[PDB]
């Protein structure tokens, strides 16, 4: 009975019908976002693959993050290409829906993994008994990808025939849990920083972790809060008018896609060579 897979294309056509100007504005925003994400993530992938040598677990998590960002960026114009060249065909609307699920899951959890690795390398050096060991980072990335696939299969279904929403158990294990983890980690960092008795380079490392955690928190609260807020309100408040639901859903999807363009602030914290090649590219462009 009208699964979510049908509902995505139906919402696309419905916004194009009811609000043509807003639909075209969102198209322009998506195109600009795709351009910026493509150039930034291509530069990041080149830097993190063909330039850096020390393959720390943070580098592995960041490489998986730029792969996810590149996939979402590639899926961004695929939505409009499928909507125009192959309208009516809703089986071929799968790639951009999968891009939505990848942006919702993999980006969130890889940012969480980067924050966890940064925290564990500051306060508690365990001697790399369980952490570090880049095979462990590869296994964690593989498990995150498998979790994304399992989440997509559980939401959409085996053949995309799952009705209703069933959203309460997703936003807690998908948005509230990483937010809680990052919040408790930045709270621990703030509590450690407030207590006196820290030497200057330790304090510098702690405040750098503070900037990284707060940046990831801002990305979480800007690019992903409206989507889960709409998902909660569509179940707790079904009285809500339909036009408001459609507009809010499309704006939330636009911000969730904006996550791809807003992600590369983390790459400045991950490595030091990113701004170096950015300056090199700027110098090449100037001359």
């Amino acid at each position: 009975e009208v699964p979510l897979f049908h509902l995505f294309a139906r919402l696309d056509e419905e916004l194009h019908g009811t609000f043509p100007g807003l639909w075209l504005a969102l198209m322009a925003v998506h195109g600009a976002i795709f351009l910026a994400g493509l150039v930034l993530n291509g530069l990041a992938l080149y830097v993190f693959c063909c330039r850096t040598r020390a393959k720390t677990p943070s580098v592995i998590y960041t490489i998986n993050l730029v792969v996810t960002d590149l996939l979402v960026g590639l899926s961004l114009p695929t939505r409009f290409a499928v909507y125009y060249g192959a309208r009516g065909c809703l089986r071929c609307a799968f790639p951009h829906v999968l891009g939505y699920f990848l942006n919702m899951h993999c980006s969130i959890w890889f940012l969480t993994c980067i924050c966890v690795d940064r925290y564990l390398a500051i306060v508690r050096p365990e001697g790399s008994r369980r952490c570090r060991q880049p095979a462990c980072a590869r296994a964690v990335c593989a498990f995150v990808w498998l979790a994304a696939g399992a989440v997509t299969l559980s939401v959409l279904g085996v053949t995309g025939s799952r009705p209703c929403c069933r959203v309460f158990a997703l936003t807690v294990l998908e948005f509230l849990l990483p937010l809680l983890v990052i919040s408790v980690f930045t709270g621990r960092i703030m509590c450690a920083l407030s207590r006196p008795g820290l030497l200057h380079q330790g304090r510098q490392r702690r405040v750098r972790a503070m900037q990284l955690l707060l940046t990831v928190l801002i990305i979480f609260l800007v690019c992903f809060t409206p989507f889960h807020a709409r998902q909660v309100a569509v179940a707790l408040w079904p009285d809500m008018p339909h036009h408001t639901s459609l507009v809010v859903y499309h704006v939330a999807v636009t911000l969730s896609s904006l996550n791809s363009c807003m992600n590369p602030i983390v790459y400045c914290f991950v490595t030091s060579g990113f701004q170096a090649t950015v300056r090199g590219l700027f110098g090449q462009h100037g001359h």
Partner: antibody, heavy 124, light 107 residues
Framework: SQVQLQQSGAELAKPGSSVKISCKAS????????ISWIKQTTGQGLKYIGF????????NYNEKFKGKATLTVDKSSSTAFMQLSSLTPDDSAIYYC????????????????WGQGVMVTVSS | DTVLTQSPALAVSLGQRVTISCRAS??????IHWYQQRSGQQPKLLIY???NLESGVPSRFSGSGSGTDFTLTIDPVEPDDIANYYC?????????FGAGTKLELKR
Amino acid sequence: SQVQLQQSGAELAKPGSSVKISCKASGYTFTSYYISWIKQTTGQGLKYIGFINPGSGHTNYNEKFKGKATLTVDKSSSTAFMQLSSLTPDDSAIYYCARGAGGFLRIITKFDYWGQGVMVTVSS
Amino acid sequence: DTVLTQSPALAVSLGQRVTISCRASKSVSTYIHWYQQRSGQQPKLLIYSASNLESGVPSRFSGSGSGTDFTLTIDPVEPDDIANYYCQQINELPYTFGAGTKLELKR
């Protein structure tokens, strides 16, 4: 063959009952083009009822006809159906199905072909 | 919801130029379809997007205008053009048709 949108014969109904009128498309890929249903009375002019995408199943209705007309699609035989519920002598009119081509700036930018029209007469 | 008001029905003569005026309520850029409802026949699309001829209609028809006022020009006329004419906007979703003009011969 050329594009055609065949329709059923004239229907005489009873007040308070329901009727179903079918528009069978032929000569083109059925799921690639919208099917729109439009009214015409003798006294007034033409009035647009709604449309439906056969592929994605997305439907849109006029505000006046919401809750009165219901649009469905059978893709196996490539036929659109419109159901009138709670018929009243107001609804005695001629109904047309139009093949609306998809557009870029708007959802539909062309209305190429029309059915021959089905006359629905509601009288006790 | 746009309201489209058409010109009153006017008498036409064989061979002379005629025009039909359709005035909208709000602004419709170029989204007026011009049909032709004959006696006991389905409407046949003559003009789409208020300026372009349909593939098949003779070149004697010509649509013009943008914004609020639109015109459809027929020159010359023959007894195949004595029929209804409807202007339909497709800008906003409640598609509104005009009242329709009755062309007829004069004697």
